[PDB]
């Protein structure tokens, strides 16, 4: 049971914008939609019924860490961008921790999207969904908003084939375990194979660490979802990069677009483009087709 008289009253406040009531909140338990470490994500309805997606914390059983993860963030509700996810809400209740409730994604996440032979989305359609996430992330970048985790498994798709850039804010997790690793400097598990080299060294993110991982996601994109470096075991993805390797060009990517891919990974992160400079060098790509 979460007592908000013993949250911080700040985080209460903030929570209060978007409570959902429970009443108002049915879940399909027996649904899973998808699974993360924190919890599963499970089809509901809100209500005027509208098809959502609920997603558990209730792997987080301590007060402070349910604190902690409401803190970092409760920021989602501030976000509104076409190519962002949003929150619809958190519906708290009698037992368990707090439901954070989603727009329902009717094409799940961009990675398993892309990979089922029966969509294969064509190399137009592929820039596009890129040219999309740049965007989203353009905007989050805007706000000052440094996502840590951007990836193809981490974009949903809804049902008019907007990309949303996701697994950020509430709805954080890590949601396909198979794709992070312990083997870092903090010990705990990390997508060490989107990460930016100094972000492997020094244990920091920023915006322009989001810029090298986008740029991994574009590649993924171009390869129709192959995982990167298949061949670089996890304790060697840092020397690798240090030796100034970089995944290698995709056989269906224009020439332009791996120059794009290039300036991503510069080993100086001041002299990756800005989200900003990508929209525009992207968009001018994809007008080509
Ligand atoms: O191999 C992993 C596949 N997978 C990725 C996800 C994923 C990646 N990023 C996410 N950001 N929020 N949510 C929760 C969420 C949000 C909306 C959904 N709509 C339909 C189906 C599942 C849904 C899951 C996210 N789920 C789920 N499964």
Request: aromatic fraction near 10%; include cysteine; hydrophobic fraction near 40%.
């Amino acid at each position: 049971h979460i007592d908000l008289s013993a949250l911080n009253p700040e985080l209460v406040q903030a929570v209060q914008h978007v409570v959902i009531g429970p009443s108002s909140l049915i879940v399909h338990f027996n649904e899973v939609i998808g699974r993360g470490h924190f919890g599963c994500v499970y089809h509901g309805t809100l209500l005027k019924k509208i098809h959502c997606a609920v997603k558990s914390l209730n792997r987080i059983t301590d007060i402070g860490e349910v604190s902690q993860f409401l803190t970092e963030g409760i920021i989602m509700k501030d976000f509104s961008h076409p190519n962002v996810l949003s929150l619809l809400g958190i519906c708290l209740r009698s037992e368990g921790s707090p439901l954070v409730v989603l727009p329902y994604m009717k094409h799940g996440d961009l990675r398993n999207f892309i990979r089922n032979e029966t969509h294969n989305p064509t190399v137009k359609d592929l820039i596009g969904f890129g040219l999309q996430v740049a965007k989203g992330m353009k905007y989050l970048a805007s706000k000052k908003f440094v996502h840590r985790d951007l990836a193809a498994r981490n974009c949903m798709l809804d049902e008019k084939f907007t990309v949303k850039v996701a697994d950020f804010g509430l709805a954080r997790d890590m949601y396909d375990k198979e794709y992070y690793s312990v083997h870092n400097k903090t010990g705990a598990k990390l997508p060490v194979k989107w990460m930016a080299l100094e972000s492997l060294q020094t244990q920091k993110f920023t915006t322009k660490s989001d810029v090298w991982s986008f740029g991994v996601l574009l590649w993924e994109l171009m390869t129709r979802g192959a995982p990167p470096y298949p061949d670089v075991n996890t304790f060697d993805i840092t020397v690798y990069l240090l030796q100034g390797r970089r995944l290698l060009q995709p056989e269906y990517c224009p020439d332009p677009l791996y120059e794009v891919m290039l300036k991503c990974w510069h080993p100086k992160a001041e002299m990756r483009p800005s989200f900003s400079e990508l929209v525009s060098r992207i968009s001018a790509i994809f007008s080509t087709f």
